[PDB]
């Protein structure tokens, strides 16, 4: 279930072990653009929120 | 060097180096001016001595 462009849902993710390797590995995920960060270093960073 | 990849973070490091060199050249110029001032003062002090 995904909402429209307006009144979009917001999910807070915190206190968990992140693993971005399972994100860009999917085949249909053609568009993967990042701003201010690199896709290869996503699994080595630490985010406060 | 940890958030972004080196091939995508080269311009940031270049701009940082440029800014630091520009900030250090002004310090070198101020040091040269103050050294000339101190040299003139020391010459005057030696003449008075």
CB-nearest partner of A45 from B3, B5, B8: B3
Query: First CA to last CA across chain A, in angstroms?
Result: 24
Q: Report in angstroms the alpha-carbon separations of B7 from A7, A40, B2.
A: 38, 12, 12
Residues of chain B found within 8 Å of residue A37, distances taken between Cβ atoms:
3-4
Closest CA to A42 of A27, A29, A30, A24: A24
Report residue A49 as tokens.
């929120």
- Judge: B2–A40 Cβ closer than 8 Å, yes or no: no
d(CA A9, nearest CA chain B) in Å: 27
d(CA B6, nearest CA chain A) in Å: 10
What sections of B1-49 are H helices per DSSP? 10-48
Length of chain B: 49
Q: What resolution (Å)?
A: 3.4
């Amino acid at each position: 279930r995904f909402a429209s462009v307006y009144a979009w849902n917001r999910k807070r993710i915190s206190n968990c072990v992140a693993d971005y390797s399972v994100l860009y590995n999917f085949a249909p995920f053609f568009a993967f653009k990042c701003y201010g960060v690199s896709p290869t270093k996503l699994n080595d960073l630490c985010f406060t929120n | 060097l940890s958030r972004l990849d080196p091939p995508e973070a080269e311009v940031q490091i270049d701009r940082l180096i440029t800014g630091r060199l520009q900030s250090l050249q002004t310090y070198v110029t101020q040091q040269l001016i103050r050294a000339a001032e101190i040299r003139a003062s020391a010459n005057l002090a030696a003449t008075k001595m």
